[PDB]
Amino acid sequence: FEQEVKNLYNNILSDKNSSVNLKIQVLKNLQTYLQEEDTRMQQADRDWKKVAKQEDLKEMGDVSSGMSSSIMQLYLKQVLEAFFHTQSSVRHFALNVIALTLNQGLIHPVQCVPYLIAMGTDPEPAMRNKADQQLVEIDKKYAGFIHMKAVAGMKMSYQVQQAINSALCSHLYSMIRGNRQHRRAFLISLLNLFDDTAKTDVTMLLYIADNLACFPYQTQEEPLFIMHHIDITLSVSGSNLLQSFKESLIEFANVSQGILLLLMLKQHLKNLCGFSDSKIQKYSPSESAKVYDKAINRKTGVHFHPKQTLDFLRSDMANSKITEEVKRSIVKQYLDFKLLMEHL
Amino acid sequence: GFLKLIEIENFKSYKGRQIIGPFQRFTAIIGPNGSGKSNLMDAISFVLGEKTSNLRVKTLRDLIHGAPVGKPAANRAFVSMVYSEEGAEDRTFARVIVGGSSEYKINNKVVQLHEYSEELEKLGILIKARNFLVFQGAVESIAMKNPKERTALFEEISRSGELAQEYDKRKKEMVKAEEDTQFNYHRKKNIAAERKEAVRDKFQETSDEFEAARKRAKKAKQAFEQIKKERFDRFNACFESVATNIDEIYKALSRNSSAQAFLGPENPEEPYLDGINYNCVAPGKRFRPMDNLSGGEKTVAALALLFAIHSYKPAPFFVLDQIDAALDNTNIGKVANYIKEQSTCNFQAIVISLKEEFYTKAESLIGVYPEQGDCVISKVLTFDLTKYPD
Amino acid sequence: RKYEAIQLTFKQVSKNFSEVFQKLVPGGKATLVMKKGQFTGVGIRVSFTGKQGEMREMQQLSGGQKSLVALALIFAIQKCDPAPFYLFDQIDQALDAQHRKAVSDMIMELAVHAQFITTTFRPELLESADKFYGVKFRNKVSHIDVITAEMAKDFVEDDTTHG
Amino acid sequence: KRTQQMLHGLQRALAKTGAESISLLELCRNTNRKQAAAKFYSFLVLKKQQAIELTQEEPYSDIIATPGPRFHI
Amino acid sequence: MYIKQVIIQGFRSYRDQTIVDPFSSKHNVIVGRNGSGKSNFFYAIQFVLSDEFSHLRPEQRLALLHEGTGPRVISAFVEIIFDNSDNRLPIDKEEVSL
DNA sequence: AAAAAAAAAAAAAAAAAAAAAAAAAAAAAAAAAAAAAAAAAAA
DNA sequence: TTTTTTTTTTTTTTTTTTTTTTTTTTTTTTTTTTTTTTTTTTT
Numbered sequence A: 001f002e003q004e005v006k007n008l009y010n011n012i013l014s015d016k017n018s019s020v021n022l023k024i025q026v027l028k029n030l031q032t033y034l035q036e037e038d039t040r041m042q043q044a045d046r047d048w049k050k051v052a053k054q055e056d057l058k059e060m061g062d063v064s065s066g067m068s069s070s071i072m073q074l075y076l077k078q079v080l081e082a083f084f085h086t087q088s089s090v091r092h093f094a095l096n097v098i099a100l101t102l103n104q105g106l107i108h109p110v111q112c113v114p115y116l117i118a119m120g121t122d123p124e125p126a127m128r129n130k131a132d133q134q135l136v137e138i139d140k141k142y143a144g145f146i147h148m149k150a151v152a153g154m155k156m157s158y159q160v161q162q163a164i165n166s167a168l169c170s171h172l173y174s175m176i177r178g179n180r181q182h183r184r185a186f187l188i189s190l191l192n193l194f195d196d197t198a199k200t201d202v203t204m205l206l207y208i209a210d211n212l213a214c215f216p217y218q219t220q221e222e223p224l225f226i227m228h229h230i231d232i233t234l235s236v237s238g239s240n241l242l243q244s245f246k247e248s249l250i251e252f253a254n255v256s257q258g259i260l261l262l263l264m265l266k267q268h269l270k271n272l273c274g275f276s277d278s279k280i281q282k283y284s285p286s287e288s289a290k291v292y293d294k295a296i297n298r299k300t301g302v303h304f305h306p307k308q309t310l311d312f313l314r315s316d317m318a319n320s321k322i323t324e325e326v327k328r329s330i331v332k333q334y335l336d337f338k339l340l341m342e343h344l
Numbered sequence B: 001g002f003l004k005l006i007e008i009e010n011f012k013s014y015k016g017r018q019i020i021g022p023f024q025r026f027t028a029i030i031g032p033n034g035s036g037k038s039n040l041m042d043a044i045s046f047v048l049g050e051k052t053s054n055l056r057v058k059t060l061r062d063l064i065h066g067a068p069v070g071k072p073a074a075n076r077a078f079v080s081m082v083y084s085e086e087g088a089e090d091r092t093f094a095r096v097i098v099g100g101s102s103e104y105k106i107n108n109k110v111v112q113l114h115e116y117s118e119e120l121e122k123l124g125i126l127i128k129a130r131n132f133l134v135f136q137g138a139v140e141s142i143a144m145k146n147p148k149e150r151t152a153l154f155e156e157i158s159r160s161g162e163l164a165q166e167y168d169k170r171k172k173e174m175v176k177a178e179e180d181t182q183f184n185y186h187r188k189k190n191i192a193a194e195r196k197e198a199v200r201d202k203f204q205e206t207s208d209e210f211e212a213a214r215k216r217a218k219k220a221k222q223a224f225e226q227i228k229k230e231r232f233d234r235f236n237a238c239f240e241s242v243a244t245n246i247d248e249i250y251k252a253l254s255r256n257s258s259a260q261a262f263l264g265p266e267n268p269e270e271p272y273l274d275g276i277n278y279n280c281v282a283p284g285k286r287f288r289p290m291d292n293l294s295g296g297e298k299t300v301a302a303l304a305l306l307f308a309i310h311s312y313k314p315a316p317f318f319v320l321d322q323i324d325a326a327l328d329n330t331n332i333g334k335v336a337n338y339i340k341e342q343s344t345c346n347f348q349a350i351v352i353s354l355k356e357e358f359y360t361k362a363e364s365l366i367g368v369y370p371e372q373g374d375c376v377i378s379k380v381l382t383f384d385l386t387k388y389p390d
Numbered sequence C: 001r002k003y004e005a006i007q008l009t010f011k012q013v014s015k016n017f018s019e020v021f022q023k024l025v026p027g028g029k030a031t032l033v034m035k036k037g038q039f040t041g042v043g044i045r046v047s048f049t050g051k052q053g054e055m056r057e058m059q060q061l062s063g064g065q066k067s068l069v070a071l072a073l074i075f076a077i078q079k080c081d082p083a084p085f086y087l088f089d090q091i092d093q094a095l096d097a098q099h100r101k102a103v104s105d106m107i108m109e110l111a112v113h114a115q116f117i118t119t120t121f122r123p124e125l126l127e128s129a130d131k132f133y134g135v136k137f138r139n140k141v142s143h144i145d146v147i148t149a150e151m152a153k154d155f156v157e158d159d160t161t162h163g
Numbered sequence D: 001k002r003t004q005q006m007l008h009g010l011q012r013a014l015a016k017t018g019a020e021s022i023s024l025l026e027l028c029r030n031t032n033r034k035q036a037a038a039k040f041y042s043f044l045v046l047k048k049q050q051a052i053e054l055t056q057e058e059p060y061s062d063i064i065a066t067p068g069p070r071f072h073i
Numbered sequence E: 001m002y003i004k005q006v007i008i009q010g011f012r013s014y015r016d017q018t019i020v021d022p023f024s025s026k027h028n029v030i031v032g033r034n035g036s037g038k039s040n041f042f043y044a045i046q047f048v049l050s051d052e053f054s055h056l057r058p059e060q061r062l063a064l065l066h067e068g069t070g071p072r073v074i075s076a077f078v079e080i081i082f083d084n085s086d087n088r089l090p091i092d093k094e095e096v097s098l
Numbered sequence F: 001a002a003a004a005a006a007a008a009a010a011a012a013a014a015a016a017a018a019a020a021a022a023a024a025a026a027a028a029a030a031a032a033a034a035a036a037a038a039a040a041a042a043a
Numbered sequence G: 001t002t003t004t005t006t007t008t009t010t011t012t013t014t015t016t017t018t019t020t021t022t023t024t025t026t027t028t029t030t031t032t033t034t035t036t037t038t039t040t041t042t043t
Ligand SMILES: Nc1ncnc2c1ncn2[C@@H]1O[C@H](COP(=O)(O)OP(=O)(O)NP(=O)(O)O)[C@@H](O)[C@H]1O
Pocket: B012, B013, B031, B032, B033, B034, B035, B036, B037, B038, B039, B040, B062, B063, B064, B065, B066, B067, B068, B375, B376, C060, C061, C062, C063, C064, C065
């Protein structure tokens, strides 16, 4: 509780320190405190009868019990921030501290769900194994929680990947899959809020599209839903843009990359399922719950989305210049756009 | 300002004309069972307007004295307070019932309901919101309220409920326009394909139709975005104020430092459309769902939520009616200490209680006693308590 | 045979209820009326402090009065045909000390038939008890054991502090 | 019953002056807060059982008490 | 009939609750500080003898186990021993256990 | 001659209620392993 | 009367399939209110 110790830890854990042994040492201090306190509490409770007759009935102490909680509330936030470190030992120790905290319920769980989700995409297997197991335990007790922090999850995930360098976050979808409302909402949120009119970084769009194509599906309702809304937005937005370009430019480069990425996602989906355009246009949202219950057949080795999307990102890659070659690439992009709108 | 005094006549077991004494900053209303004090709270709940079902009597005619026994007393009733704020003026609200109907009066001038309401809203009493009247069993209920009702309350208090019909009407308009644009686009595409397979008039028809539909869609889009932005901004302001203050308030009220309370929404892009939930941690225990917690923590949690909601937008007074239903002497002492430490310069608070540890800290008492008759006729008499030690 | 049994037991329960409730409240009276009939419901008519003019219905009463009515009904149905054991949790919270004395004396008389477990936070209700208990909550677990009348009567009222 | 003990206190407090008027301010003249509240509440619970009739004129003023029907004399 | 005593392990906040000196016949009042956990006693007594409690969702069953410290339990058990000396309960013994 | 008080009919509202579709815990069935018990033999 | 292998019966466990049941809006109905409409009284 002392002020100097407080400021000491809250400076070492933050402030972009050169040392990486101080941070490891701090996290190890917290970890050993938590473990030792837990063991002491348990093994001191086990032998009650020797001291029972000499303890009050009207007191019900808390300062010996609540203390272990209070401590965390002074440091917790900083520890969570330490997930975004380039070293690996720091990340491992931070995850150990959080997984010792939560397993005694000391702190409120749904404020450290997003970080615990973005920790689901590390290379080392033991890391994300521990993380995902912690997540399924957080869910199995409390039904709602994960649905509250789902998009912030992916945002933190993308920040983690840009700090380090199937689907990376497929597990999250497996957890949120069951409920029709939840799933539907989540999909619409991510899609409508990231591609249509948000000036998001051209890399986050790539990442979202990669994850939208990779996701494990176990019915037929989901890709048809995605395709349907994709259709509507593509139609309106693309039509407006292309017709204004015909009436008539880096802004075009940006919005064109957006719509093109969305196009290629649609095409990869349609090729991975091989569904007839008639069936797609026939389907409407909430037509019936049980009609599209068939398991989607998958053609082997049709994954061309990664290569294709990287090719079309290499076409742009935030490259605007006062040179003839980019103008040529842009006119080809426009003719390609006409071809895309002509796809049948 | 505050609530100076009220006046009853024939209303719900208060025969004759009598003046309830002037109210100090923090009073208490003691008395033995069946004396009829909690309906005095109903009296306060009747001036400010309240649906009859919450007044624990059907049909609104059984308010007049002596109806539940079988013989009424008159065909009138007359309840009226005198709100007094700084500036040496005094306003007198009333609400008289005749036959079945009810008429409202301000300063002995007949008015219509809407202006009466708006006058109260000017004062600061969101009558339909009901964030400051607690009935006997309501306090426990507030903590366990289903998320939907809590969203309803938070939308009511914050003036973001009036903008509903406009919003979803705009929503339906834009969804229809978008569907029709897609329809026309695909029809034009298939007509183009059937043309290339080889008609002209149909092509131009669907083209012009698609153009008109697009224009209407764009007309719907920005307007929907405008109204949704409005509702979101208002709701979000109110909600963030409540959240920060509930955390601080709960820590202060439990006189500990290991308690948390998280007031969190679902669907955090449009919080007004989905239920909000409330999870609190005990003073010295683990995180458990709200249902599991014992009654003693439940009542402190509900008190925390009430005080936070009030601490966003002020309300001149409370009416607490037996909040100490289940609290032990220590917890009641803590709650009473907080009420005393807050009551001076923040809000007037009038409580009904039985445990002497709650009306001992009080500063002015109002005894309420019965008298035998054709029906139990109640009467009132006051007592000062700021001329005594400890 | 079923209809006949219904009739006789309703009669006995009606009489016992009128007796108990006349005893609990110092002054008043109440009875159980059947509905139209086959039968469809049982209504209750209660009156006190006027004793002849008053004839009430249920929704407009007090905490103490409602709790007294309910307790009267339960004690009646006990006095007709005893049940294995009764467990009361925080029964006395709404009512006042005078009624609490009445309820405790009725418990004291009725004890000799069935087993009674109950909790409370006010002294009067343990005016009549065989053996008390306590519940201590240390190290995030709760234990239960026997205690003596002195420490219990002290904990219930005698101390008023932060511990 | 503490209440009837205080009732005996009332009987003896009245039989000394005989002006059939037990004032409350005097009976609480030299006490602390808790016992003052207790005494006031005791007057109320006594008035319930008709054993005493009490009078109050002004909104904030002393209480004047006098024996009623069931004083038991 | 006459509840002799109760045994609880891992139910709601009772880790390991061995035997207690037996109840009486007349009146056994329980007191305890606010939030101590007296109501869980009656929830045990009702969880065994009354069917209504066991109509909950699987989540509630998962949440009806002492999750305090150390490992997490999986097998809770509540036992009640009472004596039908008056042979009110038909199966003839002196202390029926359930 | 015209303001006022008082009952009655029409209209908005709200709570009991009739209805339908997605979901979910539960009951029934079937196969395999295991565990207690009867039968000829026997000590 | 009591022990043993072999056979016979019970029962127990674990999946898959059917079944009641809870919920989830949506719609309908009915009582309450209240505003207007209708009807004598009086200054
Ligand atoms: N309209 C009425 N006219 C006359 N008496 C009534 C009326 N409504 C209720 N009562 C009775 O008058 C008393 C008022 O009840 P109530 O106001 O609830 O008392 P109380 O203040 O709650 N008692 P308590 O909470 O125990 O201190 C009760 O006896 C009612 O039965």
